[PDB]
Structures are given as C-alpha cells and as structure tokens.
C-alpha cells in the first residue's frame, strides 16, 4: 500500500480483533489481549459512509432514457435518438465505474494511512521509553500495567512518569 502499514511493516491483520478496524494488542504481567481503537475506527466509519453516500448522491442526476418511436422515413432522427441515449448511458456507466475504481483505491489507502497514523501516534507517545521492534510492536523499557496500556491507547501516556525507569533499563541493556 501507499502508506506501508497494512501488509507492509505490519505483515497481517488480526482475526481476534472483531469490534473494530484498527486497534492494539497488549501483553504485560497482568495478561494479554486485543482492544479496538474506537476513535480511529469511528472516524474511518464516518469517512467511508460519507464516501458511499456522496457517490450515490453524485449519481442522483444521471441520464434517464425515454422511449421514442419513429416511422420508416425518419431513420436519420431515429438513429440520432438511439446514439444520443446510448451515448449518455455510456457516459454515465463510465462515470460510475471509474468513480468506483478510483474511490476503492482511495479507501484502501485510507485504511492504510489510518493504521500508519495510529502506529505513529503510539511511537511519538513512547519515544525512547520503548524500543521499536519493526513489526508494529513496541517493547517497553519499563513496566506498563493495564492503566499504562490504556494511557497509551487513549493518548495520555505520561513519558516523564516512566522516563527514569526506562533510562535505567536502557543503560543496563547498552552496558551489556
């Protein structure tokens, strides 16, 4: 994908996460589990719903064919009528098909972007208090209980609260 998250540095999706499009999997001393990110999921839902409705509403004023009849000495205007109606039908079929193709591409890339942005949100919260594993996961340099995990998920992680413990752990690792 354009944003390198879905099927990128995050190789695959989670069948275990059913209540959302994007989210987290945490693992600490108290256990492990999935938790869908409500805010990004709802923003994506709103975006996709508005997209579908906008496509449908932009096809509100498409050409509607009308039956007209002509006699045997009106072949020129009968052919003109046929070509006019067929032409408009082809134009609007092209519009529908092309819009669906283009917006499908944009929708897939939109999900990719949302995943990447959620990952970067967590990354910029944690900074050097955690290590980037390269697969979508962060390995904390400090103990991160369920309340810590929730502070990460809702965007209220307190870096200075754990910075000293993380520094001690980082120095221990770097010193071998």
């Amino acid at each position: 994908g354009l944003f390198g998250a879905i099927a990128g540095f995050i190789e695959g999706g989670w069948q275990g996460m059913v209540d959302g499009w994007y989210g987290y999997h945490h693992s600490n001393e108290q256990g492990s589990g999935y938790a869908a990110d409500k805010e990004s999921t709802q923003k994506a839902i709103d975006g996709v719903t508005n997209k579908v409705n906008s496509i449908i509403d932009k096809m509100n004023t498409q050409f509607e064919a009308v039956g007209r009849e002509f006699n045997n000495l009106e072949r020129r205007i009968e052919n003109l009528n046929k070509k006019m109606e067929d032409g408009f039908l082809d134009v609007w079929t092209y519009n529908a098909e092309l819009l669906v193709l283009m917006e499908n591409e944009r929708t897939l890339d939109f999900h990719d972007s949302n995943v990447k942005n959620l990952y970067d949100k967590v990354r910029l919260q944690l900074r050097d208090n955690a290590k980037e594993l390269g697969n979508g996961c962060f390995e904390f340099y400090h103990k991160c209980d369920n309340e810590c995990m929730e502070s990460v998920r809702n965007g209220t992680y307190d870096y200075p609260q754990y910075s000293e413990e993380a520094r001690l752990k980082r120095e221990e690792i770097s010193s071998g």
Partner: protein, 324 residues
Amino acid sequence: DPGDQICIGYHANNSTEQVDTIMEKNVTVTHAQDILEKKHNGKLCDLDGVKPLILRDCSVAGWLLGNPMCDEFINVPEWSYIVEKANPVNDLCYPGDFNDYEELKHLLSRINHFEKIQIIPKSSWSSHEASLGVSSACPYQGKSSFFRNVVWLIKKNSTYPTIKRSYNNTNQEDLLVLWGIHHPNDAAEQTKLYQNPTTYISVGTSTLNQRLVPRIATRSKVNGQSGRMEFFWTILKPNDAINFESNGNFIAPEYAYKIVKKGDSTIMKSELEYGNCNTKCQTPMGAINSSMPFHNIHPLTIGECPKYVKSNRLVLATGLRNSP
C-alpha cells in the same frame, strides 16, 4: 529480560468479497458493499397499485380506432403505463396509414385515462348509407366488419350529398378526435361507392385547416385489400368545434376520447403480459424491488427506480485489504 509489549494492528476476517482498483483487480477486502441490483421478477405488475393497460395482440392504433378484434379495450379503466408488443397482429385490419402516429403515441405517454363518448351518432346519417362500410379485411366473428369508432359512409340511392357536420366540444377536457379517408382502387370503385368522381374532406378547428383528397393508385393486396384507409386525428380543446365537409370517401367519426386524467405514463415495448403483482419500479423485462442505488436490468423504467448502468458488477470497498 523481555519487557512488556504493545502492538498496533488491524482487522482481518474470512471475507472473500473482492473489489477492483486502477492498479489491481480482485482485491479481497474485509467489508464491501454491492451497489448494483441485478435481479427482477420477470413480470409486469401494477405500478403502486394501479394496473397497467396491457394491449396484448392489439396495437395502439387498433385500440384507438376500434379494430373489431380489440373489443377487450372498448372501454378501459385508468392505467399506470401501457404495454404494447413489438408487432401486434391486430393493427390496421383494413390496410393503410395512421397520420402522425408516433406524435400521437408521444401524447399518450402523458395520459392515464380516456373516456369514450359518442360525438356523431352512426344513426344520424339520413342522407348516406352508414351500415354497409364493412370489409373482410376486418372480420368480427366470421362476419365482415370495420373499425368501431369510425363510420365508412357509402352513397345512398346512387347519390352522395355534400356532408356538412359540426361537433362542439362542450366538455371540460381535451378531446382526441379521429377520422379517415378511403383511397380506392380505381375510378370505377370511386363511382361505385361514392358516385362523385372528384372528392375532398375538409376539416377545421381553431387551429386545424385540412383538406384531404383521395389518392387512386394500383396497390398490392394487404389483408386481401388493395384500397387503403388513411386516418387523421386532432386534439379539440374545450369550447372549440370541429367542422367536417365532404362529398365522398369520408370515414366519419362516431366515438371520440375525452382526456380525463393526465400524468406520467409510458408505452413499454414488451412481449410479456400481466403477472398479477405490484411493484414500485417496472421495466419491460420485469419489476424491481431493491434498495440498491443502481441496476442493470433495462434502461427504460418507470416508477421509483435505481439508476441504470451497463455494468455487470459495481462493488464499493468499505473495509480494508483482507489478510489471507
């Protein structure tokens, strides 16, 4: 020791729904929405409770002129749309032409009900023969007959006096008036039927100023007849009158049609007939009952319908690329 971990991920399921993009076809996604209706019931139904006028083996001309094989439609109730076959066998039983026929059908597309009214009684022709104008080309129950809404007048006692007749539209609705002229096979037939050799039919309203003259020619037999009937029509407005004058070949009106309800109609071309159903959207191939915004059944629809496209598939991606 390995520390605690938090991972960012995305939904996956066992969906096999696929979508297309510009750069990639058949992308499996976790969620998708089909927006193309592709199914119909294959029946002609009522349109919001209003039954259509299904002409079966009769054409619009056979109905309006009263082809004696079209007695099923001598008095039809209000309709929602009209259904006509591609080549109805009951049309102009006596061969000929219907002037401005397609313009009349176009007018019909905006009419929902006629009321037939007698404007000139068949029994009011005291100086002409009014009950001999029948032909084997227009059979009814094995007998020679003719279009029922017009009268083929013939000379009486070897004379055809000049007809001068008027009808004033005292109704409040527009009136569809039909008449015709007989083009005979030769001058001998002209004398035999109408006595007078040089004839005309003058027709006048506030807007119509017409004078028809018979065209004698040698023609191929159609439905056993080499003569021709050519029919003409007009819309007579309320309080306007139509005046006829003729010394021969006059196919006079008897019944006209009051336009009692105007609305959105159409003449649908279909070989199907009544299906004893109701629908909100009708196509010549069948009715549509759908919430899809698009359909590909047929471009000519009537009612509350989705938008027609020629596509075989229209699927919007809503979810994300599904991991296998």
